Design a protein around this ligand. Sequence first.
Ligand SMILES: *[C@@H]1O[C@H](CO)[C@@H](O[C@@H]2O[C@H](CO)[C@@H](O[C@@H]3O[C@H](CO[C@H]4O[C@H](CO[C@H]5O[C@H](CO)[C@@H](O)[C@H](O)[C@@H]5O)[C@@H](O)[C@H](O[C@H]5O[C@H](CO)[C@@H](O)[C@H](O)[C@@H]5O)[C@@H]4O)[C@@H](O)[C@H](O[C@H]4O[C@H](CO)[C@@H](O)[C@H](O)[C@@H]4O)[C@@H]3O)[C@H](O)[C@H]2NC(C)=O)[C@H](O)[C@H]1NC(C)=O
Ligand SMILES: *[C@@H]1O[C@H](CO)[C@@H](O[C@@H]2O[C@H](CO)[C@@H](O[C@@H]3O[C@H](CO[C@H]4O[C@H](CO)[C@@H](O)[C@H](O[C@H]5O[C@H](CO)[C@@H](O)[C@H](O)[C@@H]5O)[C@@H]4O)[C@@H](O)[C@H](O[C@H]4O[C@H](CO)[C@@H](O)[C@H](O)[C@@H]4O)[C@@H]3O)[C@H](O)[C@H]2NC(C)=O)[C@H](O)[C@H]1NC(C)=O
Ligand SMILES: *[C@@H]1O[C@H](CO)[C@@H](O[C@@H]2O[C@H](CO)[C@@H](O[C@@H]3O[C@H](CO)[C@@H](O)[C@H](O[C@H]4O[C@H](CO)[C@@H](O)[C@H](O)[C@@H]4O)[C@@H]3O)[C@H](O)[C@H]2NC(C)=O)[C@H](O)[C@H]1NC(C)=O
Ligand SMILES: *[C@@H]1O[C@H](CO)[C@@H](O[C@@H]2O[C@H](CO)[C@@H](O[C@@H]3O[C@H](CO)[C@@H](O)[C@H](O)[C@@H]3O)[C@H](O)[C@H]2NC(C)=O)[C@H](O)[C@H]1NC(C)=O
Ligand SMILES: *[C@@H]1O[C@H](CO)[C@@H](O[C@@H]2O[C@H](CO)[C@@H](O)[C@H](O)[C@H]2NC(C)=O)[C@H](O)[C@H]1NC(C)=O
Ligand SMILES: *[C@@H]1O[C@H](CO)[C@@H](O[C@@H]2O[C@H](CO)[C@@H](O)[C@H](O)[C@H]2NC(C)=O)[C@H](O)[C@H]1NC(C)=O
Ligand SMILES: *[C@@H]1O[C@H](CO)[C@@H](O[C@@H]2O[C@H](CO)[C@@H](O)[C@H](O)[C@H]2NC(C)=O)[C@H](O)[C@H]1NC(C)=O
Ligand code: NAG
Ligand code: CA
Ligand code: CA
Ligand code: CA
Ligand code: CA
Ligand code: CA
Ligand code: CA
Ligand code: MG
Lengths: 452, 424
Amino acid sequence: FNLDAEAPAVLSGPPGSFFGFSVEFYRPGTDGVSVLVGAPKANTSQPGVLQGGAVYLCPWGASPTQCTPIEFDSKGSRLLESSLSSSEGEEPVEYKSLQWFGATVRAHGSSILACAPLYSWRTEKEPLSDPVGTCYLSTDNFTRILEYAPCRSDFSWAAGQGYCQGGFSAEFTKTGRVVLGGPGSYFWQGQILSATQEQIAESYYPEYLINLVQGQLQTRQASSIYDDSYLGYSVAVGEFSGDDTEDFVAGVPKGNLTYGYVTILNGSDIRSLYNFSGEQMASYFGYAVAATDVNGDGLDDLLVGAPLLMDRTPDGRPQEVGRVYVYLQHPAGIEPTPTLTLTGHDEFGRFGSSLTPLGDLDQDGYNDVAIGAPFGGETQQGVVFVFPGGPGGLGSKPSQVLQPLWAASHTPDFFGSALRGGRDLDGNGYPDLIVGSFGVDKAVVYRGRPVV
Amino acid sequence: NRCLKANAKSCGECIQAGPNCGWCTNMPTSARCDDLEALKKCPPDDIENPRGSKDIKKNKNVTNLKPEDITQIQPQQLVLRLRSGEPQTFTLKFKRAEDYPIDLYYLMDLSYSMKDDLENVKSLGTDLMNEMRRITSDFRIGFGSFVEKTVMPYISTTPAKLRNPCTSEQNCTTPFSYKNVLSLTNKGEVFNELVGKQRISGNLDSPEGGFDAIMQVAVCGSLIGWRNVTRLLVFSTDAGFHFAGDGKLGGIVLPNDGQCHLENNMYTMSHYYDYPSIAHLVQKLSENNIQTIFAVTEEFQPVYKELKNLIPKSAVGTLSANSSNVIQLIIDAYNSLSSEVILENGKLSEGVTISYKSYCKNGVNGTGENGRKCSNISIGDEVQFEISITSNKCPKKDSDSFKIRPLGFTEEVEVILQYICECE
Ligand SMILES: *[C@@H]1O[C@H](CO)[C@@H](O[C@@H]2O[C@H](CO)[C@@H](O[C@@H]3O[C@H](CO[C@H]4O[C@H](CO[C@H]5O[C@H](CO)[C@@H](O)[C@H](O)[C@@H]5O)[C@@H](O)[C@H](O[C@H]5O[C@H](CO)[C@@H](O)[C@H](O)[C@@H]5O)[C@@H]4O)[C@@H](O)[C@H](O[C@H]4O[C@H](CO)[C@@H](O)[C@H](O)[C@@H]4O)[C@@H]3O)[C@H](O)[C@H]2NC(C)=O)[C@H](O)[C@H]1NC(C)=O
Ligand SMILES: *[C@@H]1O[C@H](CO)[C@@H](O[C@@H]2O[C@H](CO)[C@@H](O[C@@H]3O[C@H](CO[C@H]4O[C@H](CO)[C@@H](O)[C@H](O[C@H]5O[C@H](CO)[C@@H](O)[C@H](O)[C@@H]5O)[C@@H]4O)[C@@H](O)[C@H](O[C@H]4O[C@H](CO)[C@@H](O)[C@H](O)[C@@H]4O)[C@@H]3O)[C@H](O)[C@H]2NC(C)=O)[C@H](O)[C@H]1NC(C)=O
Ligand SMILES: *[C@@H]1O[C@H](CO)[C@@H](O[C@@H]2O[C@H](CO)[C@@H](O[C@@H]3O[C@H](CO)[C@@H](O)[C@H](O[C@H]4O[C@H](CO)[C@@H](O)[C@H](O)[C@@H]4O)[C@@H]3O)[C@H](O)[C@H]2NC(C)=O)[C@H](O)[C@H]1NC(C)=O
Ligand SMILES: *[C@@H]1O[C@H](CO)[C@@H](O[C@@H]2O[C@H](CO)[C@@H](O[C@@H]3O[C@H](CO)[C@@H](O)[C@H](O)[C@@H]3O)[C@H](O)[C@H]2NC(C)=O)[C@H](O)[C@H]1NC(C)=O
Ligand SMILES: *[C@@H]1O[C@H](CO)[C@@H](O[C@@H]2O[C@H](CO)[C@@H](O)[C@H](O)[C@H]2NC(C)=O)[C@H](O)[C@H]1NC(C)=O
Ligand SMILES: *[C@@H]1O[C@H](CO)[C@@H](O[C@@H]2O[C@H](CO)[C@@H](O)[C@H](O)[C@H]2NC(C)=O)[C@H](O)[C@H]1NC(C)=O
Ligand SMILES: *[C@@H]1O[C@H](CO)[C@@H](O[C@@H]2O[C@H](CO)[C@@H](O)[C@H](O)[C@H]2NC(C)=O)[C@H](O)[C@H]1NC(C)=O
Ligand SMILES: *[C@@H]1O[C@H](CO)[C@@H](O)[C@H](O)[C@H]1NC(C)=O
Ligand SMILES: [Ca+2]
Ligand SMILES: [Ca+2]
Ligand SMILES: [Ca+2]
Ligand SMILES: [Ca+2]
Ligand SMILES: [Ca+2]
Ligand SMILES: [Ca+2]
Ligand SMILES: [Mg+2]
């Protein structure tokens, strides 16, 4: 309730760039603190590349912020090395146009991970259009830049990892290990893949397109009955296995006959630890997931969004509203039944499309959470709800409701479709919250302040 | 009592304090608001006591011949004057029409596994027309096809696979989202001729784009040619279905807008709007009085049986591997759909509540949400519903209105509510 909603900072990118589609905090040190903003439809100077997408670096400080693109990749497509002879002349081996670079943006320390889940390539064998996805990783204050496309492998096409779209979702662990979701692997079974930054750097060679990282962790191909599950549609990280190695939370929103489920994987050997099931066909349970201790006992708790969840009003009318489920971790494990649920109230609002830990906004000993409903509000511009933590979990009522102060346009704002909280930008001891509104190419930064 | 204990300062307060409260105008002042019997224990003319009422406006008799002029629901309009807390009850009569017209739109999956089906469906026009004579004197049929959103990753996008999404030997036409091949017509031979001219297609991922197409058929109105009659949509496929959220893979994030985007009988916006959610389809199918028949293979019965449970006025039947059995499938699904009526009401105001009791054949009587339902309704059968509406402590300052209707019917009952919150 102590977010400064009257006077947020508004960041603006190129129109039509989907600036705000993904947002993140960057803090090598607090001195170089900044906001990162993905703009996956941005045009770049990469030769031959149309709407390659960009990531913007927005310095934080006293003066009005101005954002600039980060140069992860200034080149166009590499060439099929066998083509430069032939007769057809040069042929690209990869396809960077419309790749949505910046669709996902994450940072840990002085490292930044940016993904292009619609990046595709030819393979060097028979010509395909495999959207394997790719990521770029800048490390050590932009001094070194690595590409990581673990689904760009020797197993091609939809039967293999050709349609993986690795980086569709992504997160860093507390140690900086990279965790990627790729929902397209093995006829859309989906896949989680993970490697340390050292492993990625150790085997990075832009000469070769297939850069097998040794020691990589990845989920295994399953039988056909698991096809079209979209494991890795979303991912988060938290500790659910009792040790000091963060585990992988992953949405499987089309699993089990489209009822969906969410899985937690052991962060040491990526083996399955827990599943949590959706309650309604095609509610998209696992559209978004989050992990954070919301009741102060030091155990990470699970949050899952199902933004298409349909309920019935008292007078018998079905309505799409969306729902978020919370599962509290206990020392003996985690129960499969939700501890509590929160249901949206705006029809078609897509409550639960995005989730973020806020840390402890009011400093009462309990961490709080923000939940987006990108089409909520009276003019369907979108809304972000703040819910307080507490000894029994989250409150049933929002403690703050955030809404864009600008007027609606002819197209949706998507306010609250992207969220990032739980970091302190200005360092006033209060956590701050970044909200994307990519429909109008904006991102909003809310500062936490002392309030009673 | 509560009339006194309400301390009604005025007449209005007295009325809103309970439906048994009267207010004298001729010992505290609040004692003028007592029970109607208590105030007498005051001249009966000096007692202010506005009671509720039901007043029928339109009440055309159930019929026993254009679709406009046939009545299955009665009454069609009435006014309910509501004393706060006092329910008003009226009766709805439903009689299943004898020879009611049917529009059937055949919406078909044309990905490659349906090639053999297509070769049996190309004679469905005249065969179904023939079979429909034992059901109706007035049948029209139409045909539409669907495959998939025409973007990565749902289709391969090499120039060659764009031309031919299948193998080189197989001569598949380019992938497409939705084609209205034939708007509704009574000419079965035209159905046969056009369906026999359609080319099978292909795409990459197993679940298909049919929800995009269902939406268009529901909302495109005169382009499809729907009359105000029984509207049957046969959705035929041997695969699961994409829905809202799946678009994000292909960078499609804008929700389906539920509006018609047919140009030259082609859905042009599959690259721009996400697949519909189930909830969105529930809305637009119901609004447009579409009854849906999921004609799908045995492999996908489990999926579509669940879908059916969410989509009002829908049925699922098991399609053979080449659609050889689809006529009987349609007849059996139509018989299921037609033998049951389900009442839905529009939105009520805050403080207003509605209750249904149903009275069906063989003395099966429903209450709660089963009060909105009557099952096993034969042609010419009459069933009745007692509907009760109650307002609380005066919402609004003017009157409201809402519609009650059986799903899949154009016919409806307009209920106008007037709230008694004053006197005279
Ligand atoms: C990033 O940069 C890109 C590139 O500049 C930019 O994309 C353009 O955006 C504008 C603005 O929306 C588009 O303008 C529209 O064009 C409509 C018709 O365009 C046709 O013709 C284009 C030009 O053709 C010539 O030049 C090209 C390039 O040299 C050449 O290849 C051709 O052979 C030809 O010589 C052509 O590029 C374009 O092709 C794209 O779109 C078609 C869709 O049909 C698709 O099939 C292609 O594969 C390709 O993607 C197309 O063939 C025009 O009708 C339209 O006007 C209507 O709409 C506007 C509203 O926008 C109304 O106001 C108006 O009254 C009309 O109703 C509009 O002018 C342009 O087409 C885009 N070009 C491309 C390649 O996508 C992005 O916007 C930039 N993004 C950001 C974030 O900055
Ligand atoms: C959460 O929910 C998910 C989804 O429901 C659960 O994950 C599923 O769990 C089941 C059960 O564990 C999995 O099925 C099993 O898969 C194992 C592992 O197979 C892999 O590893 C083998 C070596 O260890 C290898 O031989 C396998 O290779 C074969 O299979 C693949 C895929 O078909 C094929 O490509 C190869 O060519 C081979 O044919 C494969 O790499 C497998 O060993 C199991 O088989 C044994 O057990 C079954 C069941 O008793 C029995 O019938 C067999 O005879 C054999 O004894 C079994 O097939 C499934 O793959 C998982 N699905 C996904 C999508 O991950 C998860 O368990 C849940 N978690 C919790 C905590 O509940
Ligand atoms: C859907 O509705 C139809 C139409 O009503 C209904 O079919 C009817 O079922 C009833 C049974 O529920 C049948 O009733 C029987 O009729 C014969 C004469 O034809 C009588 O001999 C029977 O008498 C016995 O059963 C009685 C049960 O109360 C006993 O009291 C009595 O002593 C006898 O033992 C019985 O009355 C009726 O004939 C049919 N009608 C037709 C046209 O088929 C159908 O069952 C309903 N389906 C449902 C609800 O699923
Ligand atoms: C995995 O998928 C199956 C479907 O194959 C899921 O089963 C379905 O679960 C729902 C919700 O529990 C059931 O619907 C419910 O029915 C009850 C009773 O009528 C009602 O009170 C609820 O409001 C809801 O409508 C549904 O019947 C059931 N379907 C089948 C075929 O069993 C299952 O829940 C999924 N998860 C797991 C862990 O299996
Ligand atoms: C998570 O995975 C690790 C393996 O990476 C499991 O730890 C192993 O447990 C076996 C059990 O006896 C030991 O023999 C190994 O020495 C352990 N290895 C390591 C590296 O610790 C761990 O048990 C798993 N966690 C859960 C909750 O299952
Ligand atoms: C079929 O039914 C529709 C819906 O009742 C009719 O459209 C309505 O026409 C009246 C004319 O007074 C308008 O007031 C309504 O607003 C219309 N409703 C809608 C949803 O458009 C339509 O005219 C009927 N068609 C025939 C041939 O009788
Ligand atoms: C369902 O409701 C109907 C109507 O309230 C009941 O049918 C009436 O039963 C009485 C029995 O004395 C007859 O006198 C009436 O003539 C019947 N109504 C009509 C319209 O004929 C029926 O008994 C109820 N069934 C159950 C199981 O409660
Ligand atoms: C269609 O195939 C079925 C087998 O699934 C077969 O029994 C039937 O004869 C075929 N239909 C026609 C019209 O040949
Ligand atoms: Ca762990
Ligand atoms: Ca906890
Ligand atoms: Ca708190
Ligand atoms: Ca702060
Ligand atoms: Ca498909
Ligand atoms: Ca077939
Ligand atoms: Mg198919």
